[PDB]
Design an enzyme around this catalytic site. Structure first.
Site, PDB file in Angstrom:
ATOM      1  N   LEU A  15      -0.322 -24.737  -6.573  1.00  0.00           N
ATOM      2  CA  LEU A  15      -1.404 -25.701  -6.485  1.00  0.00           C
ATOM      3  C   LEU A  15      -2.682 -25.157  -7.078  1.00  0.00           C
ATOM      4  CD1 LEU A  15      -2.587 -28.383  -5.290  1.00  0.00           C
ATOM      5  CD2 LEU A  15      -3.030 -27.015  -3.228  1.00  0.00           C
ATOM      6  N   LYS A  78      -3.755 -32.493  13.923  1.00  0.00           N
ATOM      7  CA  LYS A  78      -3.334 -32.144  15.286  1.00  0.00           C
ATOM      8  C   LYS A  78      -4.432 -31.311  15.951  1.00  0.00           C
ATOM      9  CE  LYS A  78      -1.052 -28.108  13.442  1.00  0.00           C
ATOM     10  NZ  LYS A  78       0.162 -27.523  12.820  1.00  0.00           N
ATOM     11  N   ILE A 114       2.248 -31.727   1.647  1.00  0.00           N
ATOM     12  CA  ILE A 114       1.575 -31.653   2.934  1.00  0.00           C
ATOM     13  C   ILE A 114       2.468 -32.084   4.101  1.00  0.00           C
ATOM     14  CG2 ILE A 114      -0.754 -31.921   1.961  1.00  0.00           C
ATOM     15  CD1 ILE A 114      -0.603 -34.890   2.797  1.00  0.00           C
ATOM     16  N   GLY A 115       2.373 -31.326   5.192  1.00  0.00           N
ATOM     17  CA  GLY A 115       3.089 -31.623   6.411  1.00  0.00           C
ATOM     18  C   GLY A 115       4.531 -31.152   6.412  1.00  0.00           C
ATOM     19  N   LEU A 118       5.448 -25.752   7.361  1.00  0.00           N
ATOM     20  CA  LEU A 118       5.269 -25.289   8.725  1.00  0.00           C
ATOM     21  C   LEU A 118       5.135 -26.436   9.735  1.00  0.00           C
ATOM     22  CD1 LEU A 118       2.846 -22.255   8.250  1.00  0.00           C
ATOM     23  CD2 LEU A 118       5.341 -22.209   8.555  1.00  0.00           C
ATOM     24  N   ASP A 119       4.651 -27.600   9.303  1.00  0.00           N
ATOM     25  CA  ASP A 119       4.531 -28.742  10.218  1.00  0.00           C
ATOM     26  C   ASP A 119       5.808 -29.591  10.351  1.00  0.00           C
ATOM     27  OD1 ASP A 119       2.070 -28.144  11.279  1.00  0.00           O
ATOM     28  OD2 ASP A 119       0.931 -29.647  10.158  1.00  0.00           O
TER      29      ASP A 119
END
Ligand code: CL
Length: 146
Positions: A15, A78, A114-115, A118-119
């Site tokens: 990125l 979160k 995104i998400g 790790l999420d």
């Protein structure tokens, strides 16, 4: 419709090799610890940790740094670092980012998946959500992939 939408395209690579004039986005918690994952790279590169904390943003909101004429979006998905996000809070945060983009002249936005590391969210769902959120905009989105 009055818009071309996000027209998401994918680029294999880091990125942080994207254009320095693109705005960027990633996900964090209200804690703003950024202790793992791609967040650590945002923390190390852009700093501003106390300036983020001072914004006192909550789950479903977005915190923002201006860096070299473009914006770095910290999607607050979160409450605590160790939690997992809901899709509902991710959508809220994305909507907040879109709102800021439109108020501040952003036309080109880049992000990782995104998400979906790790999420533990699924890219099938997240990708469709990004597309829907940005469908009635002309903000061009590029997703960088590993
Ligand atoms: Cl965090």
């Amino acid at each position: 419709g009055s818009h071309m939408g996000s027209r998401i395209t994918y680029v294999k690579g880091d990125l942080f090799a994207c254009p320095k004039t693109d705005s960027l986005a990633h996900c964090i918690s209200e804690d703003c610890r950024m202790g793992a994952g791609i967040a650590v790279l945002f923390k190390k590169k852009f700093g501003g940790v106390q300036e983020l904390l001072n914004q006192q943003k909550k789950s479903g909101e977005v915190a923002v740094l201006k860096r070299d004429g473009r914006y770095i979006y910290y999607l607050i998905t979160k409450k605590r670092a160790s939690h997992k996000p809901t899709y509902e809070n991710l959508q809220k945060s994305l909507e907040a980012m879109k709102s800021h983009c439109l108020k501040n002249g952003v036309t080109d936005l880049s992000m990782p998946r995104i998400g979906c590391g790790l999420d533990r969210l699924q890219w099938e769902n997240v990708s469709a959500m990004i597309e829907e959120v940005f469908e009635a905009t002309d903000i061009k989105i590029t997703v960088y992939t590993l």
